[PDB]
Design a protein around this ligand. Sequence first.
Ligand SMILES: CN(C)c1ccc(C(=O)NCCCCCCC(=O)NO)cc1
Ligand SMILES: [Fe+2]
Ligand SMILES: [K+]
Ligand SMILES: [K+]
Length: 357
Amino acid sequence: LVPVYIYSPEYVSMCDSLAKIPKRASMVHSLIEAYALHKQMRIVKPKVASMEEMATFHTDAYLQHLQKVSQEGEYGLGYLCPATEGIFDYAAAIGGATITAAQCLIDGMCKVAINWSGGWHHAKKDEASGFCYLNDAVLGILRLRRKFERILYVDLDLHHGDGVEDAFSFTSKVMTVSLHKFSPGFFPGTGDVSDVGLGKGRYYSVNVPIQDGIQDEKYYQICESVLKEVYQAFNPKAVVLQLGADTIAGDPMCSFNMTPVGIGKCLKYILQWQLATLILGGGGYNLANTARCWTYLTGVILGKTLSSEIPDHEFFTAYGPDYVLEITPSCRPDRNEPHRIQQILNYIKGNLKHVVI
Ligand SMILES: CN(C)c1ccc(C(=O)NCCCCCCC(=O)NO)cc1
Ligand SMILES: [Fe+2]
Ligand SMILES: [K+]
Ligand SMILES: [K+]
């Protein structure tokens, strides 16, 4: 049945307000519309998450503090997560949206559900972190757990998905896999290959640390090698996929050197498992590139090939001077030594030998 696309005008208007990615949500939706992909999906209106729904993960003290400062304009609300007005409502909308997508997958409405404005993977139970005020990925996973026995969370953002990993670090019911830049001084600083979870969750966390300038070919080789092993050991019943576009060449994070094609190959690999899959966005600070990326990936999900020329639509001006969908890799060096990538894969392959269902 057709992929669910989480959308309404109020939801987009809401997500547009996020001071770090102004108007990103409209740009993404607008490009998706321009290519007519929305005609081929089921549009579902996201519900706003209630206080008890957000309480499935977040502490009631954190939530009430969030609600309080959200009028005024120890819970990590500092430089990266300032206490702007309306932040509680923005957070409730995004959490509700991810939970709605989870609910669609639980009801069998679809096999794939999309919330491009979710994917806030740094937030902790009692603390905001790295622009993330609520952990919608965790909320979505917890909802899917009503139906599906084992959940795989895959995180392809530039940054380590520490909030999600930490939430599930002690359980064997959710396996977290994150590929990410791992370098001294680079946020959030966790996720070395030797981080594998703790207690009953030992070996149920996988981390692939990567260096600057990774490109599509070697990236997909890593991702495939890891996911094949995970799938065999862990046998997941549903997948939550985080696709932050801050890996994409041109991003001001200036770290990885990926194109949406390399990412999409990772996404196809997962889609061929034919499981319930909840698709989320995340980082992505070159706004037109992020819309190019997620539009392309939406094409992949629907097996359409999309035209090279960006259609005229509202933000057409943002796509100059060349006006094409493809992104060109930058000239930046690839700092990933193939011998190092090999040890990492083998290390993980070792770890996953301990996982038997
Ligand atoms: C010298 N100085 C005052 C600073 C230096 C570095 C940062 C920083 O790391 N900023 C951004 C790191 C967090 C972004 C990660 C969020 C994300 O994209 N998640 O996906 C801040 C201040
Ligand atoms: Fe990121
Ligand atoms: K990641
Ligand atoms: K785990």
